[PDB]
Amino acid sequence: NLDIIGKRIEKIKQEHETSWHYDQDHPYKTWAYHGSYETKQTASSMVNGVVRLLTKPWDIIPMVTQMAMTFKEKVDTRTQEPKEGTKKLMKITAEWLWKELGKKKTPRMCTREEFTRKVRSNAALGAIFNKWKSAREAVEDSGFWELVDKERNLHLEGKCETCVYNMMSRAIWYMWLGARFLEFEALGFLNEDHWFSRENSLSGVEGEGLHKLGYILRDVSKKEGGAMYADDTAGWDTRITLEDLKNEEMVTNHMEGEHKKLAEAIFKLTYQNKVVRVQRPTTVMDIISRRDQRGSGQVVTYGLNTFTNMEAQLIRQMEGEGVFKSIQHLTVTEEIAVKNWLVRVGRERLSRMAISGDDCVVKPLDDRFASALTALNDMGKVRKDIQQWEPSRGWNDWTQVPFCSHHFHELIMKDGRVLVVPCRNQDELIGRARISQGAGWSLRETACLGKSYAQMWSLMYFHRRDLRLAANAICSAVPSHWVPTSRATHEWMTTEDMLTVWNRVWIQENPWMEDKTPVESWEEIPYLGKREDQWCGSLIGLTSRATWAKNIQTAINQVRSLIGNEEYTDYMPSMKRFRR
Ligand SMILES: Cc1ccc(NC(=O)[C@@H]2CCCO2)nc1
Ligand SMILES: [Zn+2]
Numbered sequence: 001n002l003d004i005i006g007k008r009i010e011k012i013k014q015e016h017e018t019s020w021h022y023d024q025d026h027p028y029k030t031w032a033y034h035g036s037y038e039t040k041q042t043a044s045s046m047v048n049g050v051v052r053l054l055t056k057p058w059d060i061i062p063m064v065t066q067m068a069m070t071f072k073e074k075v076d077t078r079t080q081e082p083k084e085g086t087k088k089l090m091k092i093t094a095e096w097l098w099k100e101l102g103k104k105k106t107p108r109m110c111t112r113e114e115f116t117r118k119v120r121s122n123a124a125l126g127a128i129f130n131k132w133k134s135a136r137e138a139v140e141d142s143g144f145w146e147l148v149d150k151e152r153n154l155h156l157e158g159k160c161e162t163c164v165y166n167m168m169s170r171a172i173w174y175m176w177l178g179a180r181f182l183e184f185e186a187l188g189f190l191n192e193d194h195w196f197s198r199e200n201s202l203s204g205v206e207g208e209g210l211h212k213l214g215y216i217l218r219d220v221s222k223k224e225g226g227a228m229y230a231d232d233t234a235g236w237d238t239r240i241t242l243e244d245l246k247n248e249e250m251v252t253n254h255m256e257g258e259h260k261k262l263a264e265a266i267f268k269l270t271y272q273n274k275v276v277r278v279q280r281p282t283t284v285m286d287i288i289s290r291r292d293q294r295g296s297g298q299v300v301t302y303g304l305n306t307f308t309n310m311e312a313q314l315i316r317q318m319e320g321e322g323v324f325k326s327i328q329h330l331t332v333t334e335e336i337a338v339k340n341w342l343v344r345v346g347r348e349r350l351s352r353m354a355i356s357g358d359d360c361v362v363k364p365l366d367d368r369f370a371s372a373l374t375a376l377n378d379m380g381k382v383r384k385d386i387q388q389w390e391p392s393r394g395w396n397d398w399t400q401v402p403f404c405s406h407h408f409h410e411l412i413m414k415d416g417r418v419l420v421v422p423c424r425n426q427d428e429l430i431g432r433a434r435i436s437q438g439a440g441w442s443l444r445e446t447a448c449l450g451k452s453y454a455q456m457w458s459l460m461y462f463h464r465r466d467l468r469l470a471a472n473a474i475c476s477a478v479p480s481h482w483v484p485t486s487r488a489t490h491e492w493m494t495t496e497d498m499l500t501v502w503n504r505v506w507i508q509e510n511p512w513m514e515d516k517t518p519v520e521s522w523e524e525i526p527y528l529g530k531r532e533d534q535w536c537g538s539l540i541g542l543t544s545r546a547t548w549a550k551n552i553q554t555a556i557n558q559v560r561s562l563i564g565n566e567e568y569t570d571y572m573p574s575m576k577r578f579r580r
């Protein structure tokens with residue numbers, strides 16, 4: 001308690017000594033509360049006019065138009081301590097998993113140099129605005145790094161002064177850039193050196209790309225076993241237990257020297273003890289603390305979520321295979337049996353999974369997995385939208401399985417080669433491309449964001465009639481040389497010809513494609529079946545859509561007139577119906 005968080009708490013008091021008060025009407029049950037002080041402040045979703053003017057049929061589809069309009073009673077909940085047998089299963093599995101992940105990787109500190117290059121090319125590091133304006137400016141000022149040094153030497157001393165969370169089924173905990181640096185220095189290696197790549201972790205898909213996920217799920221489907229399970233957890237970050245945080249911290253057992261001490265301090269001082277500021281309109285700032293739940297930077301959050309999910313799913317596989325009888329207590333000989341299972345089949349059982357943070361797909365040895373719920377419930381990883389003791393419903397076809405907000409189609413090219421393509425309901429794709437975040441967008445910057453969406457569509461959703469047409473329209477409407485912008489692998493963020501990029505991604509660099517014959521035109525690249533395209537949300541067959549497609553050059557010219565006298569290319573004749 002207060003010997004680890006007091007100093008952060010003490011320091012905040014003094015900066016608002018005029019305003020401090022232990023409010024007696026505080027809403028917190030599960031968070032420890034310390035005091036309150038005076039503030040007054042809050043960023044809505046803005047519409048991208050370039051994308052909207054070129055998707056007119058969708059202006060009357062509420063599933064699209066409602067996306068641009070507009071649980072903190074899940075953060076204020078508690079998770080019970082797991083049973084002794086569950087705690088033993090988790091410790092053995094976590095110890096074994098950090099060893100496996102460490103066999104071909106070397107933990108190492110990330111550098112000021114590396115951190116500086118990140119900020120100077122826009123990565124969402126979840127910092128706050130004070131002394132300097134932006135992240136770019138703080139990193140170029142030696143005073144900042146002296147603040148970093150003071151904290152850093154404080155962490156080597158096993159103490160913390162300035163690493164404080166700011167709160168804002170989502171919850172993003174911003175810290176000041178300095179605290180983010182110290183997190184990146186100690187634990188950035190997990191992401192920077194690809195610890196959760198599929199090659200290194202067997203279950204992971206870190207860095208794989210949306211064009212590979214479908215092929216990965218089809219490879220899982222080829223294994224002998226039961227149904228494919230894809231159970232979502234209800235509020236994963238809120239169900240991370242102190243026992244989870246202690247098993248995650250065992251990565252420090254693989255470290256040495258300074259790095260070991262710096263990482264032990266991030267885990268002890270910022271993860272296993274936390275200090276948070278929350279805006280309450282009743283507008284004061286509340287300073288609350290708790291030991292458990294996830295509240296790290298989003299990139300460290302991804303890797304540790306992947307780790308703990310891999311651990312949880314291996315234990316649920318052990319339960320279905322009858323490796324242990326009860327979570328109440330592991331006998332001495334069940335411990336040897338669990339250890340022996342991991343050594344003997346651990347790597348095979350990891351390859352039966354695709355895991356991206358809290359999101360998983362598991363093809364277990366058989367369907368006993370479906371009703372193996374005691375370890376999963378007791379670890380606090382309670383399934384969403386199913387009763388606690390009701391057996392999981394599995395998927396019989398890898399093309400029906402949800403993963404990373406998509407499903408995957410098998411699409412055969414006119415030349416017989418096989419594409420496995422990502423897909424989701426087309427209203428979600430068009431509704432997201434119509435939204436921008438943040439203020440002060442010029443018309444040029446808005447156009448370049450529309451171009452990023454259009455290029456992603458050409459690369460990942462070319463098989464959807466309406467998106468290949470809308471992508472061609474947007475690329476025809478935005479000046480040819482203007483560079484796509486945004487505020488896993490993003491191959492569409494380029495000014496290279498999209499047919500050349502398509503060839504590189506789907507043919508040349510695609511390890512599931514044996515014949516490397518380049519495609520010469522977009523007309524060789526297939527669509528879904530017309531009925532499948534409608535099932536997944538196409539407007540093909542509607543009067544509104546036919547008028548849009550027929551008159552698309554008039555829409556392209558409306559946008560060109562707004563942007564002005566610039567160099568444009570006509571990409572519409574890449575499509576058969578516009579090719580005269
Ligand atoms: C593991 C993984 C890899 C890729 C993706 N998603 C994407 O690349 C796109 C960018 C915009 C939303 O979808 N999601 C998960
Ligand atoms: Zn600190």
Ligand SMILES: [Zn+2]
Pocket residue numbers: 407409423424536
């Ligand atoms: Zn689909």
